[PDB]
Every structure is written in C-alpha cells, then in structure tokens.
C-alpha cells in the first residue's frame, strides 16, 4: 500500500508517513540501518527549504540531549 | 581475634555483668558476634548463650571495633530481663506478624459492634 498510495491531502500524507514509519522501523536493529537512514534523510531533505532544514536539524539536536537526559 | 574489655560494672540488680567490648581484628572484616560470644565465654568461664552482645561499630581505618556486651547469670534471668528483639536475635523468641495496620483496622472495626459479636467480627 506504500507504493500504490499517492497522497495529496494532509491526513493522507500523515497516513503515508505512518506507513513509511512502520516499514522503516522494522529494520531498525540492522547494523546497516544507521548508514541507510542517513543517506535517505540526506536525499529527501535536499529539496526542503533552509528554514525547514534548520528546524529539522534542531529537531535532532535537542533530542540528542534528551538521550543524555533519559 | 583479640578481645579487650573496657569499663566493667557487675550489676547485682538486673543479675548481670556490664562491659564494653574492644575487638582488634586488623587484617579481617568485622567479626561476627557469635565468635565474640565464644571468645568471651571462653574468657569468663560461662556458657555461650547466656551472654548477649549488641551495637558493634567498626572504626575508620580498619582498626578496632567497639560495642557493648552483657553476661547473665542464667538463661531464666535472661528470659526475664533481656529485650525481646535481643532474644529474638538468638532464636529464643518470635513475634506474630500482622503487624500494625491490620491491627489498627481491626481495632476501629471492633468498635462498631457490641456484645459477643466483637469476636466474630474480625
């Protein structure tokens, strides 16, 4: 259902993003998962705006502190 | 390993001898109280379960340990005069566990009834 979906709505993109999240997190314990996800994040954020990218980079940054907090 | 006994008071009212134990054990851990009772009972010509010790504090640095110990005349004077937690450390005694909160709820529920019903309201 991931390949067949063509979401244009907000809730359709949320359902598409949830289906993509469920597919990606099944292979989260792979040793090659860290390099693959970093390559995938670099590819998909290249078309994003500078404001969206710096928001996304800050989203990773404080969560890394949250790993030190938890 | 080495027992020294500081200030000694023989107590004719509660039928015992009162002393402060010094234990030198310079290469060892804190010695058990059973070994202290065996050494002091070998010292004072008496049997080892009429003598009761408590409160041993090991000093800082690995040195001596200093506490109290009292040597009774007989076991029946020990069963009259010694505290029940200190007899229960020896297996001579055991307490019935409810202990305080179920007793209090049974005390405030036995106030609600009258007559012979206080026995058959738990």
């Amino acid at each position: 259902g991931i390949d067949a979906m063509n979401p244009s709505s907000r809730d359709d993109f949320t359902e598409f993003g949830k289906l993509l999240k469920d597919k990606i997190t099944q292979y989260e314990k792979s040793l090659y998962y860290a390099s693959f996800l970093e390559v995938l994040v670099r590819d998909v954020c290249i078309s994003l705006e500078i404001d969206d990218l710096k928001k996304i980079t800050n989203s990773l940054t404080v969560l890394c502190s949250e790993k030190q907090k938890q | 390993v080495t027992i020294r006994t500081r200030k000694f008071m023989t107590n004719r009212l509660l039928q015992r001898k009162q002393m402060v134990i010094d234990v030198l054990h310079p290469g060892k851990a804190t010695v058990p109280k059973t070994e202290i009772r065996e050494k002091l009972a070998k010292m004072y010509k008496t049997t080892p379960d009429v003598i009761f010790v408590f409160g041993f504090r090991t000093h800082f640095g690995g040195g001596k340990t200093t506490g109290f110990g009292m040597i009774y005349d007989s076991l029946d004077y020990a069963k009259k005069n010694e505290p029940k937690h200190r007899l229960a450390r020896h297996g001579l005694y055991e307490k019935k566990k409810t202990s305080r909160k179920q007793r209090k709820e049974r005390k405030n529920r036995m106030k609600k009834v009258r007559g012979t019903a206080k026995a058959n309201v738990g």
Binding site: - | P26, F60, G61, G62, G63
Partner: protein
Amino acid sequence: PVARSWVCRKTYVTPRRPFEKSRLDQELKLIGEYGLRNKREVWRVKFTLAKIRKAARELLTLDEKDPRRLFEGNALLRRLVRIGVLDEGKMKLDYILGLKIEDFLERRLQTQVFKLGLAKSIHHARVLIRQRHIRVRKQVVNIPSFIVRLDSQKHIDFSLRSPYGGGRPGRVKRKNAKKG
C-alpha cells in the same frame, strides 16, 4: 518537635572586592605553593586566623589583672603553642597578632607529609593522603586538612595495609604480575 540539632555556621568569608589583581595574585601564590585546591581553602584559613585575632583584639583592651584576660589568654596561647604556630618562649598575647597566614598552612597534613619526606612533591602528598596511605599513630587519615599538633607530628607513617608500607600491593601490579 524533633530530636535534632540545626546548629551550623559557614567557615569562610567571600571577599568584598572580587577582581582586585593583588588579592588574586597573593592567594593564587598560596594555592600553588601549598597545594590547595581552590580559593575557598585559602579563605577558610583566613577566617580561622581572623577569628583568633578577633579574640586577642577583644582581650587586649582590658586591665591586665582582670581574670577573664588571665584565663582566656592563657588558654588561647596554650592552644596556639599546642598546634605549633606560636613558639614555646613567646607566649604573650601581643605575639598572636604577629601570626602570618602561612603558619596554619604549614601545619596541615599535606604540607607535613611533603616536608617530612614522605612524598616527592606536595601534590604527590595530597594524592597520597586522599588514597588512604597516610596514618597518624594507628589512625588512618583521609583528610588533607588535618592540622597536626605536635604530639602527633612525631608519628607520621605509612599505613599497615599500604603497598609502600607493610604489604598486599594493589590491583595494578597484581593484574600486571599475571602474565600467563
């Protein structure tokens, strides 16, 4: 209603002018000489000398045969000759005020382990004390600020459980002496 004591006091006084270069210079010289860790360890010795000098500065305005002067001056000078910062002949109350701040830093256990030859530098003396090596007449002392009065200044030895004392060498060498 509790069975407690809340009695405590602070034992240093923070300086008023915080960034005067002469004060920073002299106290950093005392830190680097005497192997203290931070400036609060200097200010605490300034507070105990200030309390001693306030006691003598209070007693010195009295008539010299008032018995508070004759009792408490003898007790205060006896404690200063007992810890060694005032020498045995000059027990007069005017010689309390000639105490410099380097008297109480010489009588610490860290400086008296470095001056009695038990360490190779003063920082080696503090790290030797803090690792439970130094004992004072069969009491193992873990305090680097132990002020050694002179009936304990004679007995400063290595511990009976230390590798530089009696024996049982540490985990580094005994892991190192297992090669096969």
